[PDB]
Design an enzyme around this catalytic site. Structure first.
Site, mmCIF file in Angstrom:
data_model
loop_
_atom_site.group_PDB
_atom_site.id
_atom_site.type_symbol
_atom_site.label_atom_id
_atom_site.label_comp_id
_atom_site.label_asym_id
_atom_site.label_seq_id
_atom_site.Cartn_x
_atom_site.Cartn_y
_atom_site.Cartn_z
ATOM 1 N N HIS A 85 43.052 37.668 28.710
ATOM 2 C CA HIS A 85 43.616 36.592 29.530
ATOM 3 C C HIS A 85 43.984 35.449 28.602
ATOM 4 O O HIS A 85 43.805 35.541 27.388
ATOM 5 C CB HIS A 85 42.746 36.190 30.744
ATOM 6 C CG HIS A 85 41.460 35.500 30.457
ATOM 7 N ND1 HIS A 85 40.288 36.184 30.188
ATOM 8 C CD2 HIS A 85 41.116 34.188 30.527
ATOM 9 C CE1 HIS A 85 39.301 35.315 30.042
ATOM 10 N NE2 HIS A 85 39.770 34.103 30.255
ATOM 11 N N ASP A 89 39.018 31.621 24.440
ATOM 12 C CA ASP A 89 38.080 32.654 24.019
ATOM 13 C C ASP A 89 38.712 34.045 23.939
ATOM 14 O O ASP A 89 38.028 34.986 23.519
ATOM 15 C CB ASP A 89 36.812 32.646 24.877
ATOM 16 C CG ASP A 89 37.039 32.906 26.374
ATOM 17 O OD1 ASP A 89 38.024 32.399 26.932
ATOM 18 O OD2 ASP A 89 36.122 33.538 27.018
ATOM 19 N N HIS A 150 38.428 35.979 37.514
ATOM 20 C CA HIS A 150 38.198 34.836 36.648
ATOM 21 C C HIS A 150 39.468 34.057 36.383
ATOM 22 O O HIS A 150 39.425 32.828 36.255
ATOM 23 C CB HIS A 150 37.551 35.326 35.356
ATOM 24 C CG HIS A 150 37.524 34.312 34.282
ATOM 25 N ND1 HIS A 150 36.590 33.298 34.230
ATOM 26 C CD2 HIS A 150 38.365 34.105 33.253
ATOM 27 C CE1 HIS A 150 36.842 32.533 33.184
ATOM 28 N NE2 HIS A 150 37.921 32.994 32.586
ATOM 29 N N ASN A 181 32.794 29.750 34.035
ATOM 30 C CA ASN A 181 33.820 28.725 34.112
ATOM 31 C C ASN A 181 34.893 29.187 35.089
ATOM 32 O O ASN A 181 35.681 30.091 34.785
ATOM 33 C CB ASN A 181 34.400 28.443 32.742
ATOM 34 C CG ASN A 181 35.171 27.151 32.736
ATOM 35 O OD1 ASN A 181 35.773 26.760 33.762
ATOM 36 N ND2 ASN A 181 35.104 26.421 31.612
#
Ligand SMILES: C[C@@H](c1cccc2c(-c3cnn(C)c3)c(C(=O)O)[nH]c12)N1C[C@]2(C[C@@H](CN)C2)OC1=O
Ligand SMILES: [Zn+2]
Ligand SMILES: [Zn+2]
Length: 232
Positions: A85, A89, A150, A181
């Site tokens: 994605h 990170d 997410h 998150n």
């Protein structure tokens, strides 16, 4: 000394590898964000005498350290990388990869989001992943788009030779108490997306979350549970 490496065990800037199965490793690094330190995972899959990388190590210097650790521990060249994605990170370190001979890939949705948000941008677009349930082959893995979770662009990765399911940040570790998150998440669709993963990969033996410890298939149900309770 053989246990899965954890946040307080990895200084920011250092990378560790963990053998998951024959020809499959996770990579673990740590990074600071908004004044807290977090671990994160990625994947390495042997691709003949080359390696396929899934996700950066969360930053340029961490990603350079990842490449050095791969050379020390495995000694085969990383030739391609996929980012699952658009967040840092997953893509932070793509510029390092590109300058080290690695061809970098992501869905067009990920590339658009990375560009719009000022994150590093993989070079090559992965078509054939735009509708939930879509799957494509990429070297020794299958890439699967489960739907929004997410993030709206999150992909999961399956290693069929080893029945390893890399869920990325759509999947949370068993000790998780929150949905992580959620800034870019779709809490309403997330359980439906996880159900699609469960249906598509019923023979998964190892499930790897985006952050934290691998386990088995129960990570998928646990994730659905903690996302539903978060939304609640
Ligand atoms: C880089 C990543 C991120 C940063 C810090 C912690 C987490 C965690 C996490 C926290 N706790 N745990 C257990 C995991 C997860 C996860 O859940 O994937 N990602 C994280 N970003 C930042 C961002 C973009 C938005 C900009 N407005 C905020 O959104 C994200 O995801
Ligand atoms: Zn994310
Ligand atoms: Zn994440």
């Amino acid at each position: 000394s053989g246990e899965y490496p954890t946040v307080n065990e990895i200084p920011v800037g250092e990378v560790r590898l963990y053998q998951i199965a024959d020809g499959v490793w996770s990579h673990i690094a740590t990074q600071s964000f908004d004044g807290a330190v977090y671990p994160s995972n990625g994947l390495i899959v042997r691709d003949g005498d080359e390696l396929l990388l899934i996700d950066t190590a969360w930053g340029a210097k961490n990603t350079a350290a990842l490449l050095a650790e791969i050379e020390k521990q495995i000694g085969l060249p990383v030739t391609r990388a996929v980012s699952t994605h658009f967040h840092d990170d997953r893509v932070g370190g793509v510029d390092v990869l590109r300058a080290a001979g690695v061809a970098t890939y992501a869905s067009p949705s990920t590339r658009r989001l990375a560009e719009a948000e000022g994150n590093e941008i993989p070079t090559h677009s992965l078509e054939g992943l735009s509708s939930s349930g879509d799957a494509v082959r990429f070297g020794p893995v299958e890439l699967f788009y489960p739907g929004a979770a997410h993030s709206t662009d999150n992909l999961v990765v399956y290693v069929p030779s080893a029945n390893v399911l890399y869920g990325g940040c759509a999947v949370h570790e068993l000790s998780s108490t929150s949905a992580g998150n959620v800034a870019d998440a779709d809490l309403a669709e997330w359980p439906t997306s996880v159900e699609r993963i469960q249906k598509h990969y019923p023979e998964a033996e190892v499930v790897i979350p985006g952050h934290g410890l691998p386990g088995g298939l129960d990570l998928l149900q646990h994730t659905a549970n903690v996302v539903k309770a978060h939304k609640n």
